[PDB]
């Protein structure tokens with residue numbers, strides 16, 4: 001019941017500069033704001049988002065996270081001459097003050113709060129606020145590291161007070177530790193702060209021992225502060241994704257936050273003179289996408305850092321692209337996280353295991369198409385469509401004469417072909433769903449016709465306790481199976497998850513979806529995902545999240561096959577393919593027989609598929 005994305009921006013926040021010479025601050029230039037908006041204008045993204053005017057944050061809204069003494073100190077900056085602002089900023093670490101900075105800082109704060117109102121009032125689905133100056137380094141009574149007021153800390157307290165929110169998730173993917181956010185919510189379990197950052201064993205700015213993975217939280221908030229220190233530069237995409245799959249996403253879904261706030265700093269990308277990482281801008285399209293099912297999509301992205309004018313624009317658009325639901329780009333070259341990242345991931349998982357038990361270890365135009373059974377017609381949203389051709393029927397006649405029958409299953413396969421060509425050609429449609437008939441002839445005609453589309457690699461997800469419908473050996477097809485009978489997994493190109501029926505089914509499926517299925521599928525880089533569900537539910541609770549997270553692969557091109565018409569599950573499949581917001585799962589403990597089965601599958605697979613590794617490999 002909510003649509004669109006908010007883009008909050010104003011040219012006035014680019015009207016304060018660094019005046020004196022300061023090599024530490026020279027990277028923070030007003031051009032960062034102009035290049036980011038102009039890149040959104042060039043790619044047709046800014047014009048596609050609901051623009052929201054910028055307001056000033058009131059004095060009381062700023063006092064939510066700051067003290068009157070420090071606010072009054074900043075309040076007297078616009079009356080200072082260059083000699084006086086140089087002295088006022090020498091009182092702090094790596095920050096400069098301008099005659100207009102107090103004005104724009106209140107705009108950066110107000111713009112953020114206005115983004116929370118837009119998202120929480122269901123006026124838009126998600127949003128981004130291109131603001132300046134940043135926020136995550138400022139604290140109750142100090143301006144630190146380019147930041148005057150903590151914009152994201154305002155948003156969380158603001159949403160806590162004005163919307164009675166009990167659980168808020170802050171994600172800070174800047175390369176600098178947002179200590180101002182951690183300080184403010186240190187003893188606070190209502191706001192889960194996660195932050196990866198360049199650390200290099202405290203040798204990197206801001207050189208804090210609190211930035212380390214040891215800092216977990218004080219008092220009743222312990223376990224809701226998660227630091228992931230990068231100790232080596234050049235972190236690649238596989239390092240960032242492994243952090244999500246094995247640290248951030250398992251804790252987030254367990255948290256089940258009512259609002260996701262993102263400290264989007266893009267100095268964590270390739271070419272940045274401060275972060276010196278090697279992550280492509282395209283990785284951010286997936287970072288945001290992996291967080292969409294949380295808080296039913298209610299995600300407020302707020303700009304933080306990013307200082308390579310060319311690298312900054314590209315990642316801002318990748319973020320807005322996935323915010324609007326555009327297809328995420330395929331990412332290749334993924335594999336094992338580097339040994340330093342595996343060490344840091346291993347340490348933080350351990351220290352946090354006492355608070356999140358999932359980390360324990362044993363001691364050592366139209367987007368979707370719907371073809372339902374003939375005659376029926378359902379209420380499908382503004383991204384969907386129904387069905388055939390004689391060019392495809394000539395094909396279908398060839399498959400019957402060669403490999404197989406007479407029935408209207410030929411129409412099911414004839415429609416499977418028509419959408420498959422519509423997905424891989426024309427970009428006519430993206431994903432698709434086919435309520436289907438006989439399973440074996442349907443999957444065989446679907447896959448074999450998909451590999452000749454061509455589809456370099458095809459990922460197949462099948463939920464049901466059936467027999468293997470197609471084989472997997474030639475290295476071009478990977479298969480995931482959900483079932484009830486243990487298949488005694490033999491081949492590496494497969495992954496069979498045997499679950500025990502119960503109330504712990506959905507909680508275990510999510511642990512296997514984030515810890516196993518997603519890391520394998522991302523390293524696989526498929527050209528098409530083929531989902532099939534047997535008519536033999538617990539899937540209804542979780543299938544929505546599965547269909548949305550897996551769309552990060554294959555540029556979204558997913559074909560789903562449902563046997564036996566289930567109106568509730570068919571409507572759930574189409575809604576998640578259409579890009580609609582996904583209902584939360586609520587707060588979350590899998591059976592010990594389940595996690596024993598998955599780590600058994602991980603050890604069995606983590607050698608070929610390195611993205612499964614969450615520990616540094618024990619060298620022989």
Ligand SMILES: NCCCNCCCCCC(=O)CS
Nearest residue numbers: 024094145146176205304305
């Ligand atoms: N070559 C590394 C020198 C360290 N300089 C620290 C500058 C503070 C930047 C703060 C920032 O990025 C806000 S997100």
Ligand SMILES: [K+]
Nearest residue numbers: 172174176196
């Ligand atoms: K950070």
Ligand SMILES: [K+]
Nearest residue numbers: 185191224225
């Ligand atoms: K916290």
Ligand SMILES: [Zn+2]
Nearest residue numbers: 174176265305
């Ligand atoms: Zn930064």
